[PDB]
Amino acid sequence: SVIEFGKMIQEETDKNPLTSYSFYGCHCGLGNKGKPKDATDRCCFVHSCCYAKLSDCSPKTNRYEYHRENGAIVCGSSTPCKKQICECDRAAAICFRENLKTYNKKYKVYLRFKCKGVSEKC
């Protein structure tokens, strides 16, 4: 669920997830239209696609377990849905971390009417 995703983000990037990732660019949080602003915004866009595919899994509220094996996130649930949503979250957190080098503070709480273009296809 959003609780696990939230933990994951903070563990992987050391950033406050609400301030740093919930209003970023065009696709983080609730945003969903426009061409993504940069790599970070793109992590948001693929994470949304990942959740779209798993609509029958209640990605936002569905709780799951995860742990680490030498620092790596391992999704640890048996329920196919819990495994899958976790995979989405995991890939996103790693994506955020792998792209901290281009994180742009100017996009933190981006004015969404500025979002132009069509995003890629999921």
CATH code, domain carrying 10: 1.20.90.10
Distance CA 40, CA 43 (A): 5
Question: Which method was it determined by?
Answer: X-ray
DSSP per-residue letters across 20-69: HHSS-TTTSTT---S--SSHHHHHHHHHHHHHHHTGGG-TTT----EEEE
Distance CA 44, CA 31 (A): 9
Find the domain containing 111 and state its range.
1-122
- The domain tally of the chain equals 1
Distance CA 120, CA 74 (A): 29
Q: Are 10 and 89 in contact (CB under 8 A)?
A: no
| Residue 56 annotated to the active site | no
Catalytic annotation, pick one of 27, 38, 41, 47: 47
Distance CA 38, CA 100 (A): 11
Catalytic annotation, pick one of 38, 56, 67, 89: 89
Resolution in A: 2.6
DSSP annotation of 101 reads: G
| Residue 67 annotated to the active site | no
Distance CA 82, CA 65 (A): 8
Which sign, positive or negative, has the C-alpha torsion 31, 34, 39, 45?
positive
The two beta strands, 66-69 and 72-75, are antiparallel
